[PDB]
Ligand SMILES: CC(=O)/N=c1\sc(S(N)(=O)=O)nn1C
């Protein structure tokens with residue numbers, strides 16, 4: 001099946017998921033001098049005070065922190081969005097070295113990792129229906145650079161030992177995702193897709209300009225996870241990122257000048 005190895009990596013995905021060569025694939029390089037400042041872009045409204053985190057899971061591709069999305073508890077509005085989007089989960093993509101790891105790039109610069117907060121449009125009823133629509137999802141992307149430690153990320157780091165291998169999960173309650181946001185909410189936005197199979201083109205991307213800083217010790221613990229299941233040959237979970245895809249007929253807009 002698909003993965004990030006040499007025999008099942010991104011360059012092979014198109015064989016089982018032809019949309020891999022679509023017209024609005026993600027991620028992309030954000031060229032800052034080509035981006036169009038759009039004053040018609042509203043500020044983002046992130047309402048995470050009632051968020052209810054439930055569990056943390058190693059799915060063999062990354063680790064996800066899942067939330068209760070049975071009601072409007074953690075929602076994203078405003079920005080380039082029409083309607084209310086509910087937070088369902090968040091996860092990261094990272095590298096084997098501090099010089100790579102992010103999916104999106106800025107003027108070709110790669111960050112150490114990238115955080116993805118996934119939301120789905122409530123007008124569609126369930127996540128499964130949302131992914132089949134062009135405005136189905138809204139993913140908030142945040143870059144991570146290596147520097148000072150991020151206190152609000154340490155609770156996640158500490159629990160990684162318990163979900164080392166594929167399929168493992170652990171209760172993960174009372175985590176506040178507000179601790180993962182940078183000061184400013186200035187962003188870039190463009191229409192795109194999911195960055196791993198099924199690669200559906202149902203995403204409105206909102207990438208924050210301001211990265212968050214994490215310590216080398218924190219990223220190091222991400223790199224100790226495994227792609228493999230327990231009892232199988234150890235394969236380190238690193239470089240689970242898809243390289244930039246052609247922009248084609250798309251315009252990246254900026255909420256700031
Ligand atoms: C359930 C869910 O969040 N799936 C996702 S999220 C996602 S991403 N990496 O945010 O574009 N890719 N896929 C397959």
Ligand SMILES: [Zn+2]
Pocket residue numbers: 091092093116195
């Ligand atoms: Zn992702």
